[PDB]
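Assemble and predict.
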Amino acid sequence: MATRKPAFNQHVLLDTTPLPDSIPKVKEIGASSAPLLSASFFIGARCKDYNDDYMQCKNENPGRGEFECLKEGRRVTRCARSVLKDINTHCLEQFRAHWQCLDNNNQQLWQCRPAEWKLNKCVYENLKLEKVIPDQPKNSTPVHLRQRQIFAHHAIPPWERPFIPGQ
Amino acid sequence: PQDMPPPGGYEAVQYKRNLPSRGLFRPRPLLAGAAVLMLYGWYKLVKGIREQNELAREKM
């Protein structure tokens, strides 16, 4: 269906026909927006190559990327699933803290820095997956590692510190 | 007797114009005051927007 923004939808159309058996099956990711968002940089850390490969596959086949990239689509779902399996087996309490804060704070990452710093540390010490943001200004501290947040509704306490690996 | 002035005479009363200048309305400190607020505000605005710009990078 079209990517147009609807303005007068009053109905939803579903189709129960499954995929043909010739296509290998896959378990869809069963994580909501807020957990996906707390785990996005972790998914980016592990699956960046497969994510890039999938997107490059589609760009190689313009107008045909839905089909004939399915096998690469399946890899991206399995890799992301491995990060949400590993996090849920090693950082569950800290994971739930961050995504529950995110869900309560308009999904704004700068509103939950103490919960993020706790999860960032735990994830790094069990999964060796580290958060990275390309091209942040080298003349300033990275915004996600700043002790004070200007746009934060509640001030970050001074006993909650950013997680810098190697310290 | 009759209503009369006091033997000395009533003391002098103020009638000449008295609208003394005050520093709260001189323009030079007011102009200096306004400039400092604007300068401080733009310092905070540069720091604010640059931070906001970095938050958009993380969100994207």
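Helices of chain B lie at 27-59.
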